[PDB]
């Protein structure tokens, strides 16, 4: 998914990245041990691939 400005004002955006304390959630909810996220812009861009970490 995506968005870009129509409002012509500056915009402030927040998001998050899930780090479960156990795996049974991770399989049960999302059904991948793979994490790969890519939140991207022109200036900024970053990816995320975390694990369980108790």
């Amino acid at each position, epitope marked *: 998914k995506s968005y870009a400005n129509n409002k012509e004002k500056e915009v402030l955006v927040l998001w998050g990245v899930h780090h479960p*304390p156990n795996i049974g959630d991770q399989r049960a909810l999302y059904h991948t041990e793979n994490a790969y996220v890519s939140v991207v812009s022109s200036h900024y861009s970053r990816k995320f691939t975390p694990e369980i970490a108790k």
Partner: single-chain antibody, 236 residues
Framework: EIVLTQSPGTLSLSPGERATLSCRAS???????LTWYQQKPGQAPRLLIY???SRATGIPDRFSGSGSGTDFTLTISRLEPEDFAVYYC??????????FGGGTNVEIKGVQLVESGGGLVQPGGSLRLSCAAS????????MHWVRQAPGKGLEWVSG???????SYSGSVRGRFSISRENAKNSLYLQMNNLRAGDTAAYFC?????????????????????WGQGTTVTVSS
């Protein structure tokens, strides 16, 4: 949520035999969505199966099923006279409404909750019930109040997520009223405008781990655990 239809509501079969039961609805409905129960009359329900495949804790391997979309199915590998019982079909709506298949007798041929207050009232009158919690975190789970006439198909009275999105039926709504307390570890159901449709037994029921907390507690979209229920009746 959608009308189910079990198949059959009662069957008669012999030892050393399988048993196929098919609970199917109006629409096609996504398959980690149903859970499957048994009851000995006199006993409360017990949980067996969920999501058309998979199996609950403390078990043999014989009750096993399949099926998807409109037609969900639980089959059985072997029949035994200890299995003499009515098996049920409970599904979580997306309109967050449990719906109930009407019980399926097998005849074989030759931690805890506590309810509070079941009994009599006058019809058209007023009375309250409660439940109280023992040995867990009543914070987390999505709760349900449920009804059951004797030897009949069930009906679902009400349930509520821990954020506040209620679900009632359009007929039951308003006449009952739920309210919940986590710090006290208890639940409340104030009830008014009561007629003979309520002449039946009820249960308090603990369902779904919402998204998160610490514990050795996974989740399904089935129940967790039940209570022993109690009777309620209008009569004069």
């Amino acid at each position: 949520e959608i009308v189910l239809t079990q198949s059959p509501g009662t069957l008669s079969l012999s030892p050393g035999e399988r048993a196929t039961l098919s609970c199917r609805a109006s629409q096609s409905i996504s398959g980690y969505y149903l859970t499957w129960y048994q009851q000995k009359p006199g006993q409360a329900p017990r949980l067996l199966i969920y999501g058309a495949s998979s199996r609950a804790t403390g078990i043999p391997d014989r009750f096993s099923g399949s099926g998807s979309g409109t037609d969900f199915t639980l089959t059985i590998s072997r029949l035994e006279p200890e299995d003499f019982a009515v098996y049920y079909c409970q599904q979580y709506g997306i309109s967050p409404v449990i719906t109930f298949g009407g019980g399926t007798n097998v005849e074989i041929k030759g931690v805890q909750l506590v309810e509070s207050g079941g009994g009599l009232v006058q019809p058209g009158g007023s009375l309250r019930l409660s439940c109280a919690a023992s040995g867990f975190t009543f914070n987390i789970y999505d709760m349900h109040w449920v009804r059951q006439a004797p030897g009949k198909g069930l009906e679902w009275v009400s349930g509520l997520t821990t954020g506040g999105d209620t679900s009632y039926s359009g007929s039951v709504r308003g006449r009952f009223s739920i309210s919940r307390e986590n710090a006290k570890n208890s639940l409340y159901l104030q009830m008014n405008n009561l007629r003979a449709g309520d002449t039946a037994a009820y249960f308090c029921v603990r369902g779904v781990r919402e998204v998160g907390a610490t514990g050795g507690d996974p989740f399904y979209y089935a129940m967790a655990v039940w209570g022993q229920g109690t009777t309620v009746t209008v009569s004069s």
